[PDB]
Design a protein around this nucleic acid. Sequence first.
RNA 1: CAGAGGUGAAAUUCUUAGACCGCACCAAGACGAACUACAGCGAAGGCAUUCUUCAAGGAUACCUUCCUCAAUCAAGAACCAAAGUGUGGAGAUCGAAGAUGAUUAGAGACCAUUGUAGUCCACACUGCAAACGAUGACACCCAUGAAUUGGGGAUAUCUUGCACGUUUUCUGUUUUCACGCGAAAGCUUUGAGGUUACAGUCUCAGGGGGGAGUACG
Lengths: 90, 136, 33, 52, 225, 90, 84, 100
Amino acid sequence: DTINAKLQLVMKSGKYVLGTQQALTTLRQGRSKLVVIANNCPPIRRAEVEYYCTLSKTPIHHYSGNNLDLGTACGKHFRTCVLSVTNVGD
Amino acid sequence: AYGPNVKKGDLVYGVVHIFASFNDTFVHVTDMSGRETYVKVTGGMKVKADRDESSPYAAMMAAQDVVARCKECGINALHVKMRAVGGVRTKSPGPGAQAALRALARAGMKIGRIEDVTPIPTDSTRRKGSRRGRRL
Amino acid sequence: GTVSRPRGMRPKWHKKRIKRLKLRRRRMRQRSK
Amino acid sequence: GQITEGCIVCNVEAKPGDRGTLARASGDYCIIISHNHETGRTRLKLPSGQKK
Amino acid sequence: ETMARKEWYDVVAPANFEKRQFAKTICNKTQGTRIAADVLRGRVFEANLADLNQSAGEEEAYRKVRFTVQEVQGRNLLTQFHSMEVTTDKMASLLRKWCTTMETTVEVKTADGYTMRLFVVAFTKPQANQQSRNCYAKQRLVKWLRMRITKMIKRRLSKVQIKEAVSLLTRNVLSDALVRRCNPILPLRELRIRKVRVVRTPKFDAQALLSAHGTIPASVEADQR
Amino acid sequence: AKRTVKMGVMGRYGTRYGANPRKRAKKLEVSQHAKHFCSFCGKFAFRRKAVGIWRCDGCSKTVAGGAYTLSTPNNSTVRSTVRRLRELAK
Amino acid sequence: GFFDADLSYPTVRTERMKHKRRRLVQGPNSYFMDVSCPRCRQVTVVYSHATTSVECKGCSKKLCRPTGGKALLVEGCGYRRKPD
Amino acid sequence: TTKRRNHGRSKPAHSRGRVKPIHCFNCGRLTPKDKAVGRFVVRRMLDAASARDVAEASPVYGANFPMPRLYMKQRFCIACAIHSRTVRARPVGNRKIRYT
RNA sequence: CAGAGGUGAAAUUCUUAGACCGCACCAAGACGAACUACAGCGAAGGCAUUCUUCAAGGAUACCUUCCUCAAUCAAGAACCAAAGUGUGGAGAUCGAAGAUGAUUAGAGACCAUUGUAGUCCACACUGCAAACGAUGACACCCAUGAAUUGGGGAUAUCUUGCACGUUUUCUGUUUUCACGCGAAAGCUUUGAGGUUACAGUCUCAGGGGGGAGUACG
Ligand SMILES: [Mg+2]
Ligand SMILES: [Mg+2]
Ligand SMILES: [Mg+2]
Ligand SMILES: [Mg+2]
Ligand SMILES: [Zn+2]
Ligand SMILES: [Zn+2]
Ligand SMILES: [Zn+2]
């Protein structure tokens, strides 16, 4: 429950992007603090995102929930595969 | 003279199973594994009427027949196992349980250890009769 | 031994009689209609 | 011989190398009952309810 | 004639027991293809522990030991431990009306490949100055006692052979250790091993059986009159 | 408005074939034509093509099984059993 | 005996054996303590019935184990009840 | 007319809904476990006279080793308990006396 | 190896083609003895082997938060022993219907040996019980001594943190004609008390016995 508790704090005071393309953009720009990935995700896409995170030395977290569960826990009404935090105020 | 090779005063042990219900009584002598049978005499083999099969007298008569044939076998001392019907039925022994044991001792046989072996269920299937029971 | 004086006949059997009567009436009305 | 007892299987060959002859119709299966290592034989319960 | 065909044999216990030849049995003589040895193997013999150990401690008189025949050697039957049980009269006299009865089942594997199942029974007791009418135990303590017993038995019995494990079950060696270590959790009136049974055995090994039996006494059943 | 009181899809049969056979077939007909949940995607996207064949509307997945529903109750028990037995093996 | 009881002015013996909400005027049961530290020797104010985690600043920070009633104090600290 | 305060059983108002039934020892009638009459019985296997003859013939059973006994828990229906003299009817004023 | 079963006594029934009995096993389906009680849990119906696991529920403790958000009910909704119904499984035990022996003037019954539906599981219906404490829900006052289940506060015994001893406390759950009430039986901090000295709040039902819970809708 700790990650669900922290994500709401980020949504209150922070900045983020949703989606693989925007997450990779923030990783290339080196303006990202944490990446979160859902448990159902194609292995190729998961492998690419983790490769970028390793190469950039960025903390990465496995959500253990569905992409629908991650989308709900984000306060949104749509499914999300990847979340990228670019500013955390808490 | 089919006994084993032992001294004249040695004790050779067997096991007797005494099954005494309220309709009959069994006197059954085996070895310590229960696989070989020496003699088996019942109370219905000594009386002529059905109502007398469970009498203490019928049980005593059956026991004396067992002792006579055991001398041929070569058996001298008998361990005793006793039981009632058990299961989901009654757990109390029949009238001939005590008479059979006493007759064996008084006939010259040595008595070893005694144990009750009535079947006892940890949990059980429903018994006969209705929920109202037997109505007399 | 556990009950007072009923009148008529055991009430459960009386109810069973009435039940059979109603079934027969239902069948007769069904045949006519 | 490598499948643990109690497992549910399909497409079973009665003789080795026949490429599958038992439990093939839709929704059907066999149950593995026991192994015997001395004789190298496995016991199965078939869809019909027979043992083989 | 029934007794024309019968030959006498002797049943021998393993070397853990002071009385080796403890029972006598009969069998058919070999006729044609019916060999007497193959029907003799596999039989189970029951005996009282007090008789085998030739003691009068009043605690061994309520235990029975069973042995299974594994090989025939002339007119001697070589056996191995099968199971041990407390007699029914003793077990039924330990139950009390206003206390808690706790039971545990433990499965352990020895070093020789033998698998055993153990059944343990324990009873609560009231303290010296207690005035309460009952002595029921709380469920949390009962579960804790069950967990400790399972840990202790699985640790001691997984490092010994089938012969040493039998030696521990007899002489009440394992029982005293359990009572001493379980009293701090709960005041125990009595703790007993009600039954121990072998549920799996390894493959037959002729040399292993001979080592367990040590020096085998001779039989005189075939000797000339 | 409702257009029917309890006949549903079976309204195409008029007064033919009997009430109990119609009621028994309706339950399987509804399931056969429903949209089922795709665990790879996270959306309700599986449709039956022919008996036993289920195709996802967005992703290119085809799955086998069920004949009138995506998964039969016996198959879930088999899945849990297989997973536990493999967990013992490994 | 031989002495009556005034409901308005009860005795100390009777008033002490009462639930906190059954007294003439209800009031708290808890208090505050000044607590030292193991091998650190700092000062912290701790509630007598604390249920959250109370930690020493700049130290091992393990004290005040919570229970179903009063909290337990680790043996490495000295405690003193504060007034009022 | 209510005859007994406890209604002949051991189930007060706000305690329990249902108690599992058991079979009577003699007739087999099903009755709730809290209503059946229960006794514990510890009877000698043999009578006093016959015990002496068996003890004389026994190398095991002497004076410092007693013979085994039978332990049974018995529960009866109301009718079977009365006929078998286990429990008898008492005057109105004496129905309250309870032993242990 | 010569009978076993069953009964008040017997007979239907099984048995030298080996029954009954004895020992160790294998299969399948139910059930969880003794410990088990005027004990615990649940809204009621109900709930008893062990281990792992998921979401709940109550009480207790608090110098935490909030600030009237509550009580009780037509309409409307959910759950509800057993028997019974539909579709798939299962089928050990017991056993409505039925069959065969006995009792009897008769015996279709009670007794004996059997046996189909059922009894067990999944999903879908049914909505009835002496579904009883024959006692609607919420709130106040009330005599004494016990006992007992869970939590908390204060200060002798035993094992090596647990249990126990004494005294208080909150919640539950019971037992010894309290005042008083009632036609009585009886109830009594837990009311059936605090009512002609008749008013705390809401709600369901009854009005001599049948016809009848029947007829019609
Ligand atoms: Mg009820
Ligand atoms: Mg039912
Ligand atoms: Mg009759
Ligand atoms: Mg039958
Ligand atoms: Zn898809
Ligand atoms: Zn510090
Ligand atoms: Zn009875």
